Each structure stands twice: as structure tokens, then as C-alpha cells.
Amino acid sequence: SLYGQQQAYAEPFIEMMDTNPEFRDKRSYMKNEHNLHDVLKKFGNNPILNAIILTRSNQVAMYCQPARYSEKGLGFEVRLRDLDAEPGRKEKEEMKRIEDFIVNTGKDKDVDRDSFQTFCKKIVRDTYIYDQVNFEKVFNKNNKTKLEKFIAVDPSTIFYATDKKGKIIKGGKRFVQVVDKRVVASFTSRELAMGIRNPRTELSSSGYGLSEVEIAMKEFIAYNNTESFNDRFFSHGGTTRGILQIRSDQQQSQHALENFKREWKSSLSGINGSWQIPVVMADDIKFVNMTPTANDMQFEKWLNYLINIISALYGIDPAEIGFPNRGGATGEADPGKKQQQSQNKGLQPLLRFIEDLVNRHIISEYGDKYTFQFVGGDTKSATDKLNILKLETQIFKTVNEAREEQGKKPIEGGDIILDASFLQGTAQLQQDKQYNDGKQKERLQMMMSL
Amino acid sequence: SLYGQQQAYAEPFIEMMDTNPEFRDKRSYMKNEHNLHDVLKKFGNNPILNAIILTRSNQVAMYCQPARYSEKGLGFEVRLRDLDAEPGRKEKEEMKRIEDFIVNTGKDKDVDRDSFQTFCKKIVRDTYIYDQVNFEKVFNKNNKTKLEKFIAVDPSTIFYATDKKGKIIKGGKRFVQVVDKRVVASFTSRELAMGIRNPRTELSSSGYGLSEVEIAMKEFIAYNNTESFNDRFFSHGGTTRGILQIRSDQQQSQHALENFKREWKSSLSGINGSWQIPVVMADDIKFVNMTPTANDMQFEKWLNYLINIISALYGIDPAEIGFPNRGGATGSKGGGKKQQQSQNKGLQPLLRFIEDLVNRHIISEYGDKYTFQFVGGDTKSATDKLNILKLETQIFKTVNEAREEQGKKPIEGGDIILDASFLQGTAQLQQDKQYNDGKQKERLQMMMSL
């Protein structure tokens, strides 16, 4: 079973003829092809796809540092799940250790290992080429329970392992690594993550993703063709403006024509000849125009159309990558702005996907009490914090509580709210005390008299 | 019966010739087709349809996490139905357990199981391809009453089961799974959900949905044809600008013409030849133009029109997906309001549909006291909460009640509202008390004197 024991079938009921009994082939949507990722790998140098991958991964890279150490507060943090909990002395250190582990991408620091930044850039590129992310988790050899490293692995080499009965293996070696169409390694679900953004219920999809490169492939071909078309004007074309037809009773001999070419170039070529006019006394002279007087690129609208569609599949603004956004007219609790809508639509899903992968696979080694999240900045300058506390000191905080939150010594005459009504209250209660004191003393004096 | 015992017929009275006695065929609206879902499956790779499915499912994916743990408040929550109730100590834990179950998509955590995010993306894709969502509910083997997992199922495999009398089964195994036109599984209403967005009263609709892909199918075909037309200029066309007609008493031999081609390319081709002009002394020379001097894509308006219709059926702005908008040329205005309206107009129906499905099928296992809802954020920052409490402390709250809500010890001189009128009242009442004390003591002393 793919997920677990179920009475509904989740895989093709009849075993399709995979080339190998041991793993499920990555069939194209129409099953016209069985090695789809070897097709898609050919597009990894596409300039548009690479512009998207680079812009997205550059945006992502800003979060990669811990917010804890980043004075602007931008980055990620590891936090307790419950907002109501106060972390214990050991929990704060364990969270700092997990943060450090993530930063180093492993237990010890080692310059030979990817940083978290390099890891994230890798898996972003892999998502947008293959729609398949894999990274291996390597546990300590002496203690299988102790994680030491996680490293991203080439997704084109990772396949679901299949039983001889054509069923996908669960609980065992769920995954195999295949090179030259032989299995070179195998992994359990414990040892290898797989992440997919575009899941399908389709039985024959066999749990694999769905690349936008597959969907947009016709568009990519059309784009490539129009680029080659426009370039071949110079590379292969005839740029010749026209033919100068000179006509007489008989064609000139080749010798005559070649010394006429010499008179021409010696009299009219370059800057030196540039404004002279030839006089020619042929019987008739005609010039046939074979090209437009002013050439420019063709099919520009076609290009914009194609690129707009590809951008809509990837969820990016064409104008963010130097193209017209067809239709223009750009579309929160914050007073945000139109562009931020595009930023958000592009950015939060990818970050959330990465968060999901990290939470499921790494933090889960430390148990569910912790959470990994990326966090944006805050609008909490000294001015804003002082305004907030200026209200809390009216509503809640005595001077000394405020000072204590700063670590500043309490002062005699603190422990009061800074409101005149509070003082009128305390002056009332003081008078009340002095009155009750008088009343009780005179009562006592009368009782002693009686 | 389809719904229940009723005297109005809800199904075709005469049994239509279904291919199999055991299940109801998914006939097309006109009954022109009996295998409708195998028709629609061919469109699941359409770039427009996939752009819509991906944008919608990316929008939905943000809500999958619990709001409880999300400091911005965005996500979902499990809640008591009544807003007036206060949850008991055990109810809070039961709600947390149900939330955890939903997040994990099952009782235990298991990296091999779909997350809720993957489930939602799946069922969104299924709604927008088939207008049919199915997921199986798996109960504990020892206790059939205890739910363990829910898993999304391929909607193309799920059919209504029919009695030998051609009536749809109720109370029994209402559903069957059919693969290769044999029944591989069966389900009760307890074990399988079905969700439909586009219901019909039409008797022959037999309880199935209605995909927008079926309605728009002509438009999709026209789209495909216009795309092929525009692409075939490069793939198959003659791009040849024109014919250079040279004419003389007799055509040149092939040898002469081929060494004329050699003179031509050796003198005029590429950048190297780019600005030279040939002189030719044929009797007459003509150039016949066969194409426009400037080619571009054709039928662009037709494309915009088609995609506008498809977007209007799906309820999405074409500008959201990279097309000019005509239905709202110059956008729309009145009611950030433009963004808010467009976003919610797309998103809220699908979210409400998922909520309804979850409430009916999952939460109902725990009884009607609870509800599952997606919840947006709120503008309830510390600033807003402090403003609110700054009013409540004038209207309701003494300093000490506020401090208690913070868990901070009450202070002598609290128990007062921070309004000067309240203190002026209490200052009056104190004097009133001192007067009544004097009056009563002097009354008693006078009575004792008399």
C-alpha cells in the first residue's frame, strides 16, 4: 500500500509492465514516455525557467538565517508550539541546539557540508524543475536514534520501490536509488524524505508529482522555436536589401564586372565614399527591394502570450521578470500594496512547503512540543514599544513593574499606576483609614470608660 | 431510494440500459457518452485548467495549519458550536485531539500518510476536474466505531451501486469501486463520503455532479485548435517570404544555378555579407511577396474571449491568470476592496464546501457539540486589544480585574474604575457614611439621655 492498509485500491489494480519489478517507472501523463525526468532535465537550462528559479531562491535565501541572531528580526526561529507555555531552562538550550544544528545542516560544523542556505536553494530548484524533493537523513552509526546530517539528493535518481507483486513497499525499503537502470542504494521512509507540491489522486500517478514543465511543454517548444526563428535572420538568413539590376544588350564579361566592382569600392565604400553619388549610363537601371526597409523582431505578442501563460502556471508576475503583464491592472490586515499581493502569492506557499518538510522530517526527531517556522519582521520600534508600554502603565503596570521588565531597581514611590484618578483613589483610601482609626479609637475609649 | 422513502420518483422510472446492472453509469448531459470521466481525464493536463487548479489549491493550502498555533490567527480551528458556551476541562482536550487528528490526517503521526495539505490539494483538483470528491473513512479493526484514518480516493473509480431492480441502494453498500469494469470494493455511507458542488434536480442526473469542463468543452476544443493553428506556422508552415523570379529565353541548367548559389552564399550570406548588394544583369528580375512583411499571432481576441468565458464559469478573474479582462474591463471598483472582493469571490465557495464536507463526515463522529471552521486572521494586535481594554477599564474594569486577567497580583488602591466621576461618587458615598454614622450615634446618645 502507498499510505497504509485500506480497502479502496490506491494503485493500478493490474500490474502495468514496468521495465523492472523493483521500482515504479515515472510515466508521463499520457504514458507516451517512461523516463519523464530525463526529458525534463533537458529544460533545466531554459532562460525563463532559470530566471524564475533564481528570483524565487534569492527571495527565499533571506529567511534562512535565524531571526534570533538577526537584529532586524527577519529570518526563522524554532519555538515551542503552545503560545501559553513558558520554556524551561533545558528547553531553551535544546531549542538553541536545534537551531544551531539546522544552521550547520548537521551536528558538527563542517565547511564541506551545505549550509541551510545552499540546501534551500537546491530544493527550490528541484521543486521547480522536477516537482520532487528528496533529502537523506543520516543517523549516527553508534546510535541509530541520533541524527548527524541531512543532505539533499538528486531527485531524478529516487524511485518508489515496488514488491514483486507490483505493490509499493511500505514499512521496508520504500525507496531505491537507481543509476544506469540498476539499484545502487535503498532507503526506508525513516532514511529518506520525499516532498511533492502537486499531488494527484489518479491511480496511475502512483504518488508522483506533476511538473509545470510537463504541462507547459508545448509553450516551451513554441518559445524555443520563436527564439530560433528570430535569431536565424543573422545566423542563417539573407539580409540582402535588394538586387541592383543593370541591363544592356549583353551581360558584361566577368573581368569587366570585377573592375567595375573595383571602381565602385574605390569610389563609394565606407565613410570615405559615404556621400558621393555614382553616375552610370547603362541603358536601364532598376533596384528590386527584397526586404522591408526597417527590420525588427517578429511575433513579440506571441512571446508575451506564451510567457504570461508560463508565469501564470508558476504563479509569478511577468512584470517582475521583465515582461508585460497581459491585462495589467494589478489586484490583508496590513495596509499593503498591490505588488505585495504578487509577492505573497509567490512566496508563502513555497515557504510553507519547506516548513512542512522540516517539521515532518527533522524536528519530529525532537518530538511534537517544538515547531519550526519562518518569521517576518515586526513594526515594533522603540517609539511603538514605548507607546504600548505607555498604555500598559495606565492599564496594568506600576512604574516598578516596568522597571523590573527593564531590570531596573524598584523605587520607593513606585508600585503606582500613573493616573491621577488612581491617586484620587489612594487619597480617598488614606482618608478612609484615618477616619476609621479615629472611630475605632473613640469606640475603644468609650468601651474602656463603660 | 436515492435520499429516502418518498412518493415522488427521484430516479429514471424505466431502468436505462446501464452497461452494468450493479452501478449507475455517469452519462453525459445529452447521453451522447457513457464514459464521461474517461473523456474529462484527457483534459487534466490542460494548461489553463491546471493554472486555475494550482492557484486555487495554493490559496487553500495556507489555511491547512491550525490557527491555534499561528500567531497571525490564520488557519483552521475546531470549536464548540455555541459561541455562548464555555468549554469544560475535558472538552478543551477533546478539541485539541480532534485538531491533531485532522492535522495528521489520522490518529497517529506517520510520515507515510498524506498531510491535510496534500489531502486538500487533492480534493481541490478533484472538484475542478470531475466535480466529484470521495474519501474513504477507515475504522479501527478491533472497534468498528473508532475512526483511525481518512484517505482521498480517485473519483473516477467511484460509482453509485444499484440493486438488481435498478434502484440505487440505500442503507446498505451504497457505493462500489470499479476498476477495469469489475467491482473491486464496496462501501456504506458510513465508509465513503461523496461531495458534489453542482447538483441537479434532473432525474437522469442520477445524483452525479456537473463539471464545468463538460459545459465549456467546446471552448476548450476551440482553444486547442487556435493554439495548434498559431504553432503550426513554425512546426509545419511555409515561412518563405517570396520567390525571386529571374527570367531569360530559357531556364538555366541545374549546374549553372548551383554555382550561382555558390557565388551568392559566398558573397552575401550572414553578417560577413550583410550590407553588400549583388549586381545581376538578367533580362528581367521580379520578387513575388507571399507573406506579410510583419508576422504575428492571429485570433488573439478569440483567445481572450474563450478564456474570459472559462474564467467566468470557474469564477476567477482572467487577470489573476495572466489574461486581459473584458468582464470588468478596467477591473472593478466599489463595494483594498478590489483585492478583497476578487479573492473572496474565488475562494470562499470552495472553502465553505470543504468545511461542510469535514463537518458532515469527520466531526459528526464526535457529535454536534463541536464545529470545524477555517478562520482568517484578525486585527487584534496589542494596540487594538489595549484600546479595547482602555475603554473597558473606563466602563467596566477596575485596575485589579485587569491585573488579574494578566495574572498580576491585585494592588491596594485598585478595585476602582479609572474615571474621575466614579471616584467623585465614592468620595460622596464616604461622606454619606460618615454623616449616617454621626446621625445614628447622636440619635442613640440623645435617646439614652432622654
PDB file of all heavy atoms in Angstrom, chain B residues 180-197:
ATOM      1  N   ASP B 180     -11.303  -1.583 -14.283  1.00  0.00           N
ATOM      2  CA  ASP B 180     -11.386  -2.456 -15.453  1.00  0.00           C
ATOM      3  C   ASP B 180     -12.790  -3.027 -15.636  1.00  0.00           C
ATOM      4  O   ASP B 180     -12.964  -4.164 -16.078  1.00  0.00           O
ATOM      5  CB  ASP B 180     -10.360  -3.583 -15.354  1.00  0.00           C
ATOM      6  CG  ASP B 180      -8.946  -3.064 -15.190  1.00  0.00           C
ATOM      7  OD1 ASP B 180      -8.656  -1.960 -15.693  1.00  0.00           O
ATOM      8  OD2 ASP B 180      -8.127  -3.756 -14.550  1.00  0.00           O
ATOM      9  N   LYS B 181     -13.802  -2.231 -15.291  1.00  0.00           N
ATOM     10  CA  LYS B 181     -15.208  -2.630 -15.378  1.00  0.00           C
ATOM     11  C   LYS B 181     -15.509  -3.903 -14.590  1.00  0.00           C
ATOM     12  O   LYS B 181     -16.364  -4.697 -14.988  1.00  0.00           O
ATOM     13  CB  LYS B 181     -15.629  -2.794 -16.840  1.00  0.00           C
ATOM     14  CG  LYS B 181     -15.651  -1.484 -17.609  1.00  0.00           C
ATOM     15  CD  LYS B 181     -16.274  -1.640 -18.984  1.00  0.00           C
ATOM     16  CE  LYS B 181     -16.435  -0.296 -19.672  1.00  0.00           C
ATOM     17  NZ  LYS B 181     -17.102  -0.419 -20.997  1.00  0.00           N
ATOM     18  N   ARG B 182     -14.819  -4.120 -13.472  1.00  0.00           N
ATOM     19  CA  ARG B 182     -15.279  -5.046 -12.446  1.00  0.00           C
ATOM     20  C   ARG B 182     -15.228  -4.370 -11.084  1.00  0.00           C
ATOM     21  O   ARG B 182     -14.364  -3.530 -10.820  1.00  0.00           O
ATOM     22  CB  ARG B 182     -14.456  -6.340 -12.446  1.00  0.00           C
ATOM     23  CG  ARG B 182     -12.967  -6.153 -12.251  1.00  0.00           C
ATOM     24  CD  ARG B 182     -12.256  -7.491 -12.355  1.00  0.00           C
ATOM     25  NE  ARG B 182     -10.805  -7.367 -12.271  1.00  0.00           N
ATOM     26  CZ  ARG B 182      -9.952  -8.364 -12.473  1.00  0.00           C
ATOM     27  NH1 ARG B 182     -10.369  -9.582 -12.785  1.00  0.00           N
ATOM     28  NH2 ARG B 182      -8.648  -8.131 -12.373  1.00  0.00           N
ATOM     29  N   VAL B 183     -16.159  -4.757 -10.215  1.00  0.00           N
ATOM     30  CA  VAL B 183     -16.224  -4.199  -8.869  1.00  0.00           C
ATOM     31  C   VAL B 183     -15.084  -4.763  -8.032  1.00  0.00           C
ATOM     32  O   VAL B 183     -14.984  -5.979  -7.828  1.00  0.00           O
ATOM     33  CB  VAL B 183     -17.589  -4.480  -8.226  1.00  0.00           C
ATOM     34  CG1 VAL B 183     -17.619  -4.048  -6.756  1.00  0.00           C
ATOM     35  CG2 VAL B 183     -18.684  -3.774  -9.001  1.00  0.00           C
ATOM     36  N   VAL B 184     -14.219  -3.875  -7.542  1.00  0.00           N
ATOM     37  CA  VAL B 184     -13.100  -4.267  -6.694  1.00  0.00           C
ATOM     38  C   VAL B 184     -13.343  -3.963  -5.217  1.00  0.00           C
ATOM     39  O   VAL B 184     -12.629  -4.510  -4.362  1.00  0.00           O
ATOM     40  CB  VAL B 184     -11.790  -3.596  -7.159  1.00  0.00           C
ATOM     41  CG1 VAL B 184     -11.426  -4.063  -8.560  1.00  0.00           C
ATOM     42  CG2 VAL B 184     -11.895  -2.073  -7.110  1.00  0.00           C
ATOM     43  N   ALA B 185     -14.312  -3.113  -4.889  1.00  0.00           N
ATOM     44  CA  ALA B 185     -14.609  -2.792  -3.499  1.00  0.00           C
ATOM     45  C   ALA B 185     -16.036  -2.274  -3.405  1.00  0.00           C
ATOM     46  O   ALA B 185     -16.668  -1.942  -4.411  1.00  0.00           O
ATOM     47  CB  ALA B 185     -13.620  -1.767  -2.939  1.00  0.00           C
ATOM     48  N   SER B 186     -16.538  -2.212  -2.174  1.00  0.00           N
ATOM     49  CA  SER B 186     -17.840  -1.626  -1.891  1.00  0.00           C
ATOM     50  C   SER B 186     -17.794  -0.902  -0.556  1.00  0.00           C
ATOM     51  O   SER B 186     -16.954  -1.187   0.300  1.00  0.00           O
ATOM     52  CB  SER B 186     -18.927  -2.701  -1.859  1.00  0.00           C
ATOM     53  OG  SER B 186     -18.698  -3.580  -0.773  1.00  0.00           O
ATOM     54  N   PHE B 187     -18.719   0.042  -0.382  1.00  0.00           N
ATOM     55  CA  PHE B 187     -18.694   0.922   0.775  1.00  0.00           C
ATOM     56  C   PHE B 187     -20.118   1.246   1.193  1.00  0.00           C
ATOM     57  O   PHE B 187     -21.019   1.336   0.356  1.00  0.00           O
ATOM     58  CB  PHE B 187     -17.933   2.209   0.462  1.00  0.00           C
ATOM     59  CG  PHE B 187     -16.484   1.989   0.174  1.00  0.00           C
ATOM     60  CD1 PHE B 187     -16.029   1.940  -1.130  1.00  0.00           C
ATOM     61  CD2 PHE B 187     -15.578   1.820   1.201  1.00  0.00           C
ATOM     62  CE1 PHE B 187     -14.697   1.735  -1.402  1.00  0.00           C
ATOM     63  CE2 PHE B 187     -14.247   1.614   0.934  1.00  0.00           C
ATOM     64  CZ  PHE B 187     -13.805   1.571  -0.369  1.00  0.00           C
ATOM     65  N   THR B 188     -20.308   1.433   2.494  1.00  0.00           N
ATOM     66  CA  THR B 188     -21.511   2.061   3.013  1.00  0.00           C
ATOM     67  C   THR B 188     -21.371   3.580   3.019  1.00  0.00           C
ATOM     68  O   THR B 188     -20.286   4.135   2.842  1.00  0.00           O
ATOM     69  CB  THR B 188     -21.805   1.563   4.429  1.00  0.00           C
ATOM     70  OG1 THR B 188     -20.758   1.982   5.312  1.00  0.00           O
ATOM     71  CG2 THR B 188     -21.915   0.042   4.459  1.00  0.00           C
ATOM     72  N   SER B 189     -22.502   4.256   3.240  1.00  0.00           N
ATOM     73  CA  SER B 189     -22.479   5.690   3.506  1.00  0.00           C
ATOM     74  C   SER B 189     -21.572   6.028   4.680  1.00  0.00           C
ATOM     75  O   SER B 189     -20.979   7.110   4.721  1.00  0.00           O
ATOM     76  CB  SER B 189     -23.895   6.192   3.785  1.00  0.00           C
ATOM     77  OG  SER B 189     -24.802   5.731   2.800  1.00  0.00           O
ATOM     78  N   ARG B 190     -21.440   5.105   5.633  1.00  0.00           N
ATOM     79  CA  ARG B 190     -20.551   5.318   6.768  1.00  0.00           C
ATOM     80  C   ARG B 190     -19.092   5.345   6.336  1.00  0.00           C
ATOM     81  O   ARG B 190     -18.287   6.095   6.899  1.00  0.00           O
ATOM     82  CB  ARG B 190     -20.777   4.216   7.803  1.00  0.00           C
ATOM     83  CG  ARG B 190     -20.077   4.427   9.136  1.00  0.00           C
ATOM     84  CD  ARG B 190     -20.774   3.645  10.243  1.00  0.00           C
ATOM     85  NE  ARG B 190     -20.209   3.883  11.566  1.00  0.00           N
ATOM     86  CZ  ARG B 190     -20.154   5.061  12.174  1.00  0.00           C
ATOM     87  NH1 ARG B 190     -20.806   6.114  11.709  1.00  0.00           N
ATOM     88  NH2 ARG B 190     -19.471   5.172  13.309  1.00  0.00           N
ATOM     89  N   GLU B 191     -18.733   4.540   5.339  1.00  0.00           N
ATOM     90  CA  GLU B 191     -17.333   4.350   4.989  1.00  0.00           C
ATOM     91  C   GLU B 191     -16.829   5.288   3.902  1.00  0.00           C
ATOM     92  O   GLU B 191     -15.614   5.495   3.813  1.00  0.00           O
ATOM     93  CB  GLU B 191     -17.115   2.908   4.528  1.00  0.00           C
ATOM     94  CG  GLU B 191     -17.179   1.890   5.647  1.00  0.00           C
ATOM     95  CD  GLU B 191     -17.506   0.501   5.141  1.00  0.00           C
ATOM     96  OE1 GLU B 191     -18.651   0.288   4.688  1.00  0.00           O
ATOM     97  OE2 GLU B 191     -16.617  -0.374   5.190  1.00  0.00           O
ATOM     98  N   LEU B 192     -17.708   5.861   3.080  1.00  0.00           N
ATOM     99  CA  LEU B 192     -17.268   6.731   1.994  1.00  0.00           C
ATOM    100  C   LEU B 192     -18.127   7.981   1.913  1.00  0.00           C
ATOM    101  O   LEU B 192     -19.357   7.894   1.863  1.00  0.00           O
ATOM    102  CB  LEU B 192     -17.322   5.978   0.663  1.00  0.00           C
ATOM    103  CG  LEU B 192     -16.595   6.630  -0.506  1.00  0.00           C
ATOM    104  CD1 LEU B 192     -15.127   6.253  -0.481  1.00  0.00           C
ATOM    105  CD2 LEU B 192     -17.237   6.220  -1.822  1.00  0.00           C
ATOM    106  N   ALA B 193     -17.471   9.138   1.895  1.00  0.00           N
ATOM    107  CA  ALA B 193     -18.112  10.399   1.557  1.00  0.00           C
ATOM    108  C   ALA B 193     -18.198  10.579   0.046  1.00  0.00           C
ATOM    109  O   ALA B 193     -17.342  10.105  -0.705  1.00  0.00           O
ATOM    110  CB  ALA B 193     -17.344  11.568   2.169  1.00  0.00           C
ATOM    111  N   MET B 194     -19.246  11.268  -0.399  1.00  0.00           N
ATOM    112  CA  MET B 194     -19.271  11.889  -1.718  1.00  0.00           C
ATOM    113  C   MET B 194     -19.690  13.345  -1.585  1.00  0.00           C
ATOM    114  O   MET B 194     -20.671  13.651  -0.901  1.00  0.00           O
ATOM    115  CB  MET B 194     -20.207  11.154  -2.678  1.00  0.00           C
ATOM    116  CG  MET B 194     -20.084  11.636  -4.118  1.00  0.00           C
ATOM    117  SD  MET B 194     -21.194  10.805  -5.265  1.00  0.00           S
ATOM    118  CE  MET B 194     -20.505   9.154  -5.264  1.00  0.00           C
ATOM    119  N   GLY B 195     -18.946  14.229  -2.235  1.00  0.00           N
ATOM    120  CA  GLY B 195     -19.255  15.652  -2.249  1.00  0.00           C
ATOM    121  C   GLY B 195     -19.427  16.147  -3.672  1.00  0.00           C
ATOM    122  O   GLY B 195     -18.643  15.794  -4.556  1.00  0.00           O
ATOM    123  N   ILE B 196     -20.454  16.965  -3.885  1.00  0.00           N
ATOM    124  CA  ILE B 196     -20.787  17.491  -5.205  1.00  0.00           C
ATOM    125  C   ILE B 196     -21.078  18.977  -5.067  1.00  0.00           C
ATOM    126  O   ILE B 196     -21.805  19.393  -4.160  1.00  0.00           O
ATOM    127  CB  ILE B 196     -21.987  16.742  -5.824  1.00  0.00           C
ATOM    128  CG1 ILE B 196     -21.557  15.354  -6.296  1.00  0.00           C
ATOM    129  CG2 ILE B 196     -22.599  17.507  -7.010  1.00  0.00           C
ATOM    130  CD1 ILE B 196     -22.691  14.360  -6.373  1.00  0.00           C
ATOM    131  N   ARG B 197     -20.507  19.776  -5.967  1.00  0.00           N
ATOM    132  CA  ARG B 197     -20.685  21.221  -5.951  1.00  0.00           C
ATOM    133  C   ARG B 197     -21.848  21.688  -6.813  1.00  0.00           C
ATOM    134  O   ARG B 197     -22.509  22.673  -6.465  1.00  0.00           O
ATOM    135  CB  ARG B 197     -19.403  21.915  -6.420  1.00  0.00           C
ATOM    136  CG  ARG B 197     -18.219  21.725  -5.488  1.00  0.00           C
ATOM    137  CD  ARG B 197     -16.898  21.852  -6.224  1.00  0.00           C
ATOM    138  NE  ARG B 197     -16.827  23.086  -7.002  1.00  0.00           N
ATOM    139  CZ  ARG B 197     -16.802  23.170  -8.327  1.00  0.00           C
ATOM    140  NH1 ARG B 197     -16.664  22.102  -9.098  1.00  0.00           N
ATOM    141  NH2 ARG B 197     -16.876  24.368  -8.898  1.00  0.00           N
TER     142      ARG B 197
END
